[PDB]
Amino acid sequence: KIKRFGRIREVIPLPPLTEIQVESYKKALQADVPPEKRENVGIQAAFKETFPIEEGDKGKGGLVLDFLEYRIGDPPFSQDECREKDLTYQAPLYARLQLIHKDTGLIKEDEVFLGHLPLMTEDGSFIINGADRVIVSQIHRSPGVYFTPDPARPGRYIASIIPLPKRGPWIDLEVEASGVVTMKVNKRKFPLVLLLRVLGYDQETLVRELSAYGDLVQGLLDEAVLAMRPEEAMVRLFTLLRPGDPPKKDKALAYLFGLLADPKRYDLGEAGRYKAEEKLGVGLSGRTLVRFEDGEFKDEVFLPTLRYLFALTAGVPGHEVDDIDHLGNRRIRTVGELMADQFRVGLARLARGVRERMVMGSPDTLTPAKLVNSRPLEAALREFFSRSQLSQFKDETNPLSSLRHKRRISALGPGGLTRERAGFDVRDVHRTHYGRICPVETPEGANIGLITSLAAYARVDALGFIRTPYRRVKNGVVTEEVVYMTASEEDRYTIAQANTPLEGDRIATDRVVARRRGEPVIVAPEEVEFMDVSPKQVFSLNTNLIPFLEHDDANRALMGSNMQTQAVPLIRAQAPVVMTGLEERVVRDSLAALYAEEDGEVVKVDGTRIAVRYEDGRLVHPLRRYARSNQGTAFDQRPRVRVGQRVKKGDLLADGPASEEGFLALGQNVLVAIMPFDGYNFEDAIVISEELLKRDFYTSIHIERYEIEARDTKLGPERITRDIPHLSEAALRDLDEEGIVRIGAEVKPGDILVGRTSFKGEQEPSPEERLLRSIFGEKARDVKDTSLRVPPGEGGIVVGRLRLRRGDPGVELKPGVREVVRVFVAQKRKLQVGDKLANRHGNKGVVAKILPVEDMPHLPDGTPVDVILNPLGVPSRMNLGQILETHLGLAGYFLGQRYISPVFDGATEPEIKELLAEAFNLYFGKRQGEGFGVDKREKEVLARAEKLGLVSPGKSPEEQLKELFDLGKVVLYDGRTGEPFEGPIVVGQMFIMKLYHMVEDKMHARSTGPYSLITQQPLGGKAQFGGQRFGEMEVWALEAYGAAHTLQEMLTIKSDDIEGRNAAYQAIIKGEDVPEPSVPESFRVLVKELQALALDVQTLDEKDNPVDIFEGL
Amino acid sequence: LKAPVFTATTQGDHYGEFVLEPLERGFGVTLGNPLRRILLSSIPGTAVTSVYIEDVLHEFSTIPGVKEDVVEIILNLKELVVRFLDPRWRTTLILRAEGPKEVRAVDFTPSADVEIMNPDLHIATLEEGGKLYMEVRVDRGVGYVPAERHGIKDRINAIPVDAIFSPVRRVAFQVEDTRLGQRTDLDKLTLRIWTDGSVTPLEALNQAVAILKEHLNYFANPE
């Protein structure tokens, strides 16, 4: 019983939702393809790109070493082992590199072993050194060339945008006042004239044939001293390329920055030729400038962009066009392209190591596989994946998370001029790029906008760059519409008519403005290419999960757009009543669940592995159980199917993490009345009905993972044993079987989680002691306890234990580190005071009190409510539509239904009524049957609701009811005392999640203990644990008041000042008197610390001459 | 007047509208509620306390051949409502399951002074390797109690379960005014004392009043 609301839908949010990657990587990691085709980008390019390495003597002797087809191959280990043995899920990659001679000699070193190129899981992420990580797609200034106003004082500047931040230099032509036209490549400012001279141009042939209509020239001529002769030119320019290199015309160096596709090349143009052409005086080719022709160079883009400059420095072709952040200028390098460039580096180093081994060694013995030392492609490559501001863990709390995190787009990339946390130009970018296919209500706080998420139907097709959404054009296809697309307007969703949408006023967007109604009304190619396949594409895949976004105010609407990431799978995943089709797909691209393949059949046994689909072949399917989430989410799978066939409108074949039967199910939906409850729901706190705990609802299960390494340090070998000295206390093996704790064991705080003794030789057990020791059989001792034990965090039930030991197979551990015990501990948490509940409309809040069914607000027939969300502020203050969920609530509770009211299309107030209107003729249709009907309490109200001109007067009480049900809802008694709540109190089933933020993990308390031995102030330790921070802000706090003493105490008897510390604990343990300080250590020490530098810090008293007695002990 | 008319459309364990009658204008709740309040709280009942399963060292497990998942079980078993037919005591049902079947709470070994109010009650869909031998407590009790009332017993894998005692499952009450007496002003009660596990409304209602009385009593001698 599912009700849906809506209109059209020509496509689907598209497969899969993890295509940004997945289908990306592969096509960059070609490999899978027969080693013939596949021509560029990805690994191959990097290869071809690194030009066959030569060496001294250009075409004189032996050694050429040309590269060929590479070979990703026989994958060392397997996912799972990798994480178990902390290993990057890599794979070998070698490529035969036949070197040459100049006395004929063809040698092909088969394969030639090489780097380990990390593979990507079916998922769309990586396993690196055990943990799971994700490569987040960055965006930057699209390659090209496009000036921009000189931010200084009015005077447009010219920028040249090389392809990727590692395939060309950022060149800015800057026309100034004192210096004029400058060519500043990387770290070098110089007369722009000079390079031109080299390129041929020159006084007259140059300006006065270029820059006339707009002065800006004499300054370019003056240094004509440079414009007096090329060749000699380079040399002076070369001389202007630090350090003191050898002035000797070489052409090389410039053998780049234009010459050949080496460190400059937008490749076969595409976004360089295909762009500068339609920006400059047309005409161009593969790169900038062109040499190696037969002599002098032949520029292609160095004056025309200078021309087009001046032009916009005083002429008509303005186009001040700054980065213009137009997604027709904002590129996005998908993982594959981030991992590719890195190869475009591993090699950059190999080529060196190769050219070098070339020489030295015997030209007859100098063969490859002996010339190639596979260190570059690794290192620098395995360097990236786990050490990049762009490679990150993985939000794995609830599945939406993971999936979501891949759709995310970082701009905090580490590229060139790539916005630093506050890089040069920040609180400008942030803002909504008028390009809608990279959501507007997602981001967080502080990183406000430098990290956005990309829209649903966004991208998918011939991709050279930038998102590009899908946009209908009258039936048929939907065209992967570019981002620099005008295509004669666009007509927004709605106002249709079979196939001719009869609106004759159709609303549309064109270039920007919502521009009223172009009205082409051609019914033909959708008024050009107008029309958007559904709205969805306007927003983030994980926002579209909001039943009433419409009403929901952007800002707050984002506070739910995120928050709901921080779900936290439970046991009763519950899909939401009002959900939005998406709920059903998000959890099917996450692969967090187990699908099917062909037709039906089953066989199975059910439990640990939905057994073989049984379809023709035979394949068993194991079910991950009580795993561990990067966030400690405990994502397990559930077996759904007994003994049947394929699918029943969906082959869920057993759910996943936080998904009710196939539908994404973050939290639980429950019934709630709105209304201020004696303060317990003050500001934002939600009061809660004990029931939710009694019915094991919000209960979430988390499994931790404690660790211990067995060192070797010079005192004796560190060993993992169950013979912890003295720890006899019938504890040891009262648990800890032959060393480490046992499964199913139950762990409180303090118990030995994984014991291990240690030698340490503090002092020598001198006589007497050794004697007395012998005497009273006081067996001498040499080993310390140094066990593991569980921290002040309660603990839980020992779920499992892994153990890695040096010499083991695929492992490998930190030098010195031998063996490494690991132990997982579960936990099931229910719900307590503290913790957040936050719904889909950013109505976030933390539980305050939890009433017993007894109290609470009894509905009329006795059913208690669930949460007591306060109406104050929250709604008004936040203006949202978390009400149009609570209304289609009972109108779905009683009518017993789950609904689909998608974003910007459905579930309308009248329908919400129609429905609600109904589902009453039963709610109440019953009462007038069970044998009851409206009592003194309900009348007492109704006859006052109309006073509130809230219900139609004249009508019968019964009549006033239904009337007062569509809107709010029944009198709603206060099961606490007994009377009614004067004034109805809208009641309903919302849907509250339980954000990975339970109180437990927070809240600690100190008093003493873990005192430090480096800074001498409470931090780190063993037994107790604790320690609280007292920042500066609080210093002023006390300064501002007058609690001088109260302040001192925080820089005396409570931290560094030992005398004091002890004084304190001695003072209390006794009683009567208090912590008595005097001269804080902080002072006695500052003196005898400045002295050490040759200063005589004197402490003169009241009269200057009463010179202190200080430190006189 | 001088007294009402305590009607009582009863039932068969659960459902128990118990109508007083010409209660003077007001007391419609002075009585109506507390009972209802009390009837949802302080009242003796039956509830599981701990379960032990064949080869299950502790919760967060997974019994082979069984479709389910050990927690579900305990979550399901959390319901199973027993009856005791006896004065003071706790006890331990016991059930072993075979190959392909559907161990619904019913298959819970018949035994002594005990009834299984809620037979059926799909306890576990085991199959192919129907192995399930279990041992669940079931203590007398009152109210709600979780991790505290330790389910020791089979000192080992008790995986103690939650205590959900209160045999009452819902309680409301109307004040419908359509009676005689002396002038159309007074009210007319009718508390329902809805569903239950073992005990019957009348009993809940009855047991209820007692308490309210004993407390009412406490108002004795003051200092």
């Binding site: 007058g1042 003493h1045 006794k1070 009567e1072 008197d1073 208090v1074 | -």
Partner: protein, 98 residues
């Protein structure tokens, strides 16, 4: 509502902080070594409720402020001999134990 006569005290001495000192030194004088420094002892004794029953409370300042608001005591530049101000304590049962 707050401190019994907190306002009343703020009247007695001058500088708001001055008092904080007096009560402080006083508390740090009263149930600090002796207890036989009281002035409230009679029918006006700060007694604490606690299951079993009543009985004074171990909160120095508590008695302090309310002993001050009493009448005795004095403050400023008197008893010049701080030395003889704490030694005079020897003149009448002091010390404790450890």
């Amino acid at each position: 509502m707050a401190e019994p006569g907190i306002d009343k005290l703020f009247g007695m001495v001058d500088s708001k902080y001055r008092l904080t000192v007096v009560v402080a030194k006083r508390a740090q004088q009263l149930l600090r070594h002796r207890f036989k420094n009281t002035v409230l002892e009679p029918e006006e004794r700060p007694k604490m409720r606690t299951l079993e029953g009543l009985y004074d409370d171990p909160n120095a300042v508590t008695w302090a402020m309310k002993e001050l608001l009493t009448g005795r005591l004095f403050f400023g530049e008197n008893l010049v001999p701080e030395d003889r101000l704490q030694k005079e304590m020897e003149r009448l049962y002091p010390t404790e134990e450890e």
